[PDB]
Design a protein around this ligand. Structure first.
Ligand SMILES: Nc1ncnc2c1ncn2[C@@H]1O[C@H](COP(=O)(O)OP(=O)(O)O)[C@@H](O)[C@H]1O
Ligand SMILES: Nc1ncnc2c1ncn2[C@@H]1O[C@H](COP(=O)(O)OP(=O)(O)O)[C@@H](O)[C@H]1O
Lengths: 325, 62, 307, 67
């Protein structure tokens, strides 16, 4: 039925948008890179882009290369290109070049939709100056904040374009005498948003064009935060089908293992894994092993990432998680 | 006849209150499974009881 | 003029009567609950103590290795510490076999369930004729067990502007009192305080920052956080496991941050012992590090006598 | 009414919106410190902006409840 891996997605040809996210230091970035590398290696034809909003420049840290606002290609790859931009340190540079400001914090979701299209822009620009079309883009969703909440903006902006009017047509003599000192602009320029962000929406709501992958560690506070997230995404009508449970130490059988503490934690993780499996039967629950020390740079990110395709087997693969010391 | 806004606003608010008391009897840790299920449920009843609050209110408005 | 990185001041206090211990996630709430209890008991022989838990899973019983029930028994080996395990969600559900105005008003169920407990306590002090000087609450893991502290103010916010079709408005004013005579007490920094338990990782430092806010709102006193399960790896007899020493690095990072975030707080660092900490002989040994702060160098041994 | 329900409901809703954008520029992980501070702040402005929403609302059910 539903295989315990992301093979079906790394093999998929239909998808164009993939989102990876997860609060807490669970492995979002590492997974982001892994899903990227894996997809790139499995489809040579297509061209890929791994983009990150984070200010701390994580992708750069992960690979050990300096990626900037300029979509460079991963040194050692051939269709994977990373791009790190800051939409906040660009929003304070968009308009910083009044009314178009005092209505954003008023309406929940704008700032996001704005910041996002600011990104999409920086992307198509690259595809121009480089004349190279990206078939699929992977989003290293930002750690904090509901980065892609704008998907509700439409149904929310409708309550205003049906209000700013239901008051302009319920008080007629004073809707006419109501010389709107401000032209239809507000009710017309923030009317085109419910479109310029309604097309992008029927992109991210197509079960075959975009999907989200949740990263989580197997402890309570995390299985919670992600159950929350899965709900937040279900509401947006986005597709959530796979969760990658990271940092599992399959201690039940280990090489050079004879430590007491470590085996106590595994016992707990195991407990919750069984619960996750029970809670999400229709989901792709991917178990990833906890390697000894950092997983940095392509040579390792790759080696580690293959366990998103062919599920990791603690017995046989036990060694491969030690080539990373 | 005070049916829909009575027999409903009660059956629910009552069942919810019957579940909420059942949820606080299992380990959200040992039964994360069920626990989270029940919560999801209580999250719906919380909305369809906040709907019958407007269905019963907009009735004194229409 | 910094603050002591321990709970000595509270285990020594004579003024307090109510102490709440809480923390979501498997961080060590129960263990800390017992530790604060045992510690307070050993340091004040005169006074008599009660450790009570709402948890259905009967944790205190697991912790000590004794079967504590609805009947306040005394800890086998102690002299003024008595544990009591009750379930209020089940007792309040029997004399209710309606609450419709309960689920309607946020906070009642709690205030109700709480007084149901208080009751079961004074009853014990009757049939036993033994007054408890201080009670420690092993706050429930999930749900906002003590949210009723807002009930009063909230209930006002729905009386001047809102309505036996009135016998409801009668036994409801009788309530906004029982809960206000209390909240008055719980909101007194000398009589009651809350101790947060947390592990030193992000999702937990968050959940507790949240909690501290929830408590500040209720005007309850939050002054101490016990950071449990710390490694202090560098201080082991020797470097072996690398995956461990990597975690310590992270914990250390957040500890520094916690220290910076709560300068006026009693931030208590507790070491991670090898395997369970069950039964009085160990709960005690481990609990003393809530009084005299644990020193990784000297005390390094004492965390290995534990099974 | 015009100098208080305007110059205030803006200074705040604006400053909050100025902070919120500043908070999303630091690692809630590397600067947990500041990050949590800023949040605590945004949690107040969120209330004292939800107060001026009732202060600006009690001054309307008032000028119409009194001729
Ligand atoms: N499964 C794993 N096993 C071992 N180390 C891991 C694993 N996942 C992540 N890491 C380590 O954590 C670090 C990455 O944390 P990161 O993924 O960037 O946290 P976040 O997703 O919250 O940004 C890396 O330096 C890597 O060494
Ligand atoms: N500092 C510690 N060192 C070693 N083990 C600990 C420590 N703190 C708690 N534990 C372990 O955790 C378990 C208790 O967890 P518990 O306190 O009941 O979590 P919670 O408070 O969320 O219910 C015990 O079995 C004990 O072995």
């Amino acid at each position: 039925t539903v295989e315990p891996n992301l093979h079906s997605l790394i093999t998929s040809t239909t998808h164009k948008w993939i989102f990876v996210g997860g609060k807490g230091g669970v492995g979002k970035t590492t997974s982001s890179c892994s899903i990227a590398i894996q997809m790139a290696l499995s489809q040579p034809n297509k061209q890929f882009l791994l983009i990150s909003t984070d200010p701390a420049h994580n992708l750069s840290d992960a690979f050990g290369e300096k990626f900037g606002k300029d979509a460079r290609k991963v040194t050692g790859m051939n269709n994977l290109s990373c791009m790190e931009i800051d939409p906040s340190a660009a929003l304070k540079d968009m308009n910083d070049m009044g009314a178009l400001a005092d209505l954003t914090g008023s309406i929940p979701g704008i700032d996001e939709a704005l910041s996002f299209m600011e990104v999409m822009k920086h992307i198509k620009r690259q595809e121009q100056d480089e004349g190279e079309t990206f078939d699929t883009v992977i989003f290293d969703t930002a750690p904090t904040g509901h980065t892609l909440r704008f998907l509700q903006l439409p149904n929310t902006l409708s309550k205003l374009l049906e209000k700013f009017g239901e008051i302009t047509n319920k008080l007629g003599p004073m809707l006419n005498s109501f010389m709107g000192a401000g032209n239809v602009d507000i009710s017309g320029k923030l009317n085109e948003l419910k479109a310029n962000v309604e097309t992008i929406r029927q992109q991210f709501t197509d079960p075959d064009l975009t999907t989200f992958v949740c990263v989580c560690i197997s402890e309570f506070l995390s299985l919670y935060e992600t159950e929350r997230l899965i709900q937040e995404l279900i509401s947006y009508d986005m597709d959530v089908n796979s969760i990658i449970v990271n940092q599992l130490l399959f201690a039940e059988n280990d090489q050079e293992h004879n430590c007491k503490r470590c085996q106590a934690r595994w016992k707990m993780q195991k407990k919750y894994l069984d619960q996750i499996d029970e809670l999400y039967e229709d989901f792709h629950v991917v178990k990833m092993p906890l390697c000894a020390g950092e997983i940095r740079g392509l040579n390792n990110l790759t080696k580690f990432s293959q366990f998103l395709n062919k599920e990791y087997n603690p017995i046989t693969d036990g060694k491969v998680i030690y080539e990373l010391e | 006849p005070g049916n829909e806004l009575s027999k409903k606003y009660l059956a629910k608010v009552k069942e919810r209150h019957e579940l909420k008391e059942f949820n606080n009897s299992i380990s959200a840790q040992d039964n994360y499974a069920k626990w989270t299920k029940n919560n999801r449920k209580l999250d719906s009843l919380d909305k369809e009881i906040n709907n019958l609050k407007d269905e019963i209110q907009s009735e004194n408005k229409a």
